[PDB]
Structure formats: structure tokens, C-alpha cells
């Protein structure tokens, strides 16, 4: 029915500050990713995290089912492996269906 | 003569704490806007209806939308918003 | 001889306190410039109009706009900027 | 394999003045399998462009350009508006921060 957004996106920036070893302070605000899937079928999503320096890394999979939307922190990613911090990256957004990607 | 915009926009995050949609409608026609307004664990909710006149804007408040519910505070949303004519949406 | 961007950009949001348009001609012509300021409760004022000239950028102040009239202050106002030759505007 | 993005990137506004950043930042992301040769032009209010400014982002690689950094053909002289048109062989993708 209801088809909005596209099956790929692509965020150029993306850095987690170093901020040692306990939670993300209160202080810093995050990096994150915000999916809304407004079709009828749930969405299979891929993250692929590219780097200055090194081959890219994912799939990171994840799904935001028909008719919902979800918050993506890339600081929660850890499978294939967690992203390093105060590392520049950049990451591409892909989908079976479309979806509206947004970058706060 | 002058038609900007198009008929359907999705902003992908909303946020009221424990914000505004403006709309610009160029055209010679008044756009009917319906506002549909997405969870991450409920169905959505809408269409809130509101009417943005020919060569008008108007902005929106996400925190005066009632009918046909007032949106939860403190929560995460994203909203489609849909028009009879092309209509020009912007959010901060 | 670049083109690059387009002839008719929208900003749906617009409020001066009780601000910028920066706008890029990559291209080998003056580009002319016309604003028309839409409002929530009156009819559209302008032409304002303004030349940003082959190659330069220029940042247009919506509190510096006067001709046809001042846009009054906190007012919540739209903006629509046609060019003769595309033209990359950020607000 | 993967093609995202776009050959040419404007961006309108540039302006040189314990733990973040604010220098004028372009971030650039090739996620195609052939380097991208990027060419960047220096757009002012009142004077000619200056460029090419010449660098490569490899192959499904990003990188950050601080426009700070920028010297061939010339430095970007500071407290000066500009804007810039970013300009490759191959589709990338450009944000500035």
C-alpha cells in the first residue's frame, strides 16, 4: 500500500566520542539513526560502517517491522563487531523495502 | 501558475518533551494535509486533518494535534504527511 | 561553464526575532534573483528582487529585505527564490 | 559494485573562524570500487573561485576534509563566507559538518 522513502541511504559522517569505559556520559549528545518503515511488509535492514583506513564492516542487521519506526544508536552495533570510538566513519543504510532514513 | 512541492513527506523523528511542521502551500488550490503519525510499538494514528489555504503557510505544532488523539509526550514518533496538492514541508 | 542546482527553491520556515539565504551561482550568467514571502494570514509580498552574479555566492539577510516593504518581526513567514539560472540556495 | 551518491556536491555556506570539534568539515563517502579524484572549487562573494583542490578518497573509503587543511592552490583565508562545489570522476557521497 503506503510506499515512502527508498531501499538506500548513505550518512557520510559518523564519530562516537572516546569516552572511556563506562556508559555514554549524559553530557555528549549520541549519534543516531531514525527508521521509519510506513509500508505494509517489515523491513530487513543492512548497515555497512566504512572507514579512512580500512575495509568496511557489516552487515549489521537489524528489522523495523511494517508500520513502525525505530532509533538506531551506532554505539548499540556489535555484530559483526562493535564500531571503535573517536573513529571517524560513515555508513550505508539498505533495505528490502523502502524506508525514510534520518540522521540526528 | 506556480506548483512546488509534492504530496507526500515523511519526517522520521518526532519528539515531544516530558516539534513544528511548517508548510508552504504556493499553489492556487488550498491542500487538505492529512497527518498520519508513526510509533516504534503501535499502530500509527491518524489522519489529523488541517487545511493549509492557497498562496499560504502555516505552521503545526505537533503538541496541538488532538483529533483523532493527542500525541504522548516523551515519546518518540514520525509522521507522514500527505496533501491533496503539492505542498512544501520543513522541519527544524 | 557549470550548472549545477536549480531555478525555483522553497524554505517553508521564516521568523525574525521579535534569518540567512546563502545562495551559490556556479555558473557563467548573473543570475536574477526574485523572493516572494508567503505569510499564514496575507497574500504573498515581492518580487524582492537581488543579482548574485557568474561564479560568486551571496548571503541574503531576511531582516535586510525592503523593497517592496520590510518583512515585519516576529512573524512566522516562507520564502520562494525563483533565478533566470539555477542556483544553489541554503538557508 | 555499490553506486551511491553523486558526481557534484554544492555546499553554500563555509566560513573559517575538554573533547569536540568546530572547524568547517566536509565528510566524504566513496563506497564504490574505484577511487574518487576529487576536484573542489572555492566560491567568495567578491572575488574569482580558486581551484582545483586536488585529493582522493580510495575505494569504499571515507574521509574528512577540514577545509582548515586546504593550501593547493592556496589557503582559504579565514573570517571570509564562502562556498564550494565538490566535483568527482565517480559517484560519492558529501556531508559538512
Known sequence: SLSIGRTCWAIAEGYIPPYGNGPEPQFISHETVCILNAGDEDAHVEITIYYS????????????????????????????????????????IQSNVPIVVQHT
Open 53 to 92: 583506513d580500512k575495509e568496511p564492516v557489516g552487515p549489521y542487521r537489524l528489522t523495523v517491522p511494517a508500520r513502525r519506526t525505530k532509533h538506531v544508536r551506532f554505539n548499540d552495533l556489535n555484530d559483526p563487531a562493535p564500531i571503535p570510538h573517536d573513529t571517524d566513519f560513515a555508513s550505508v
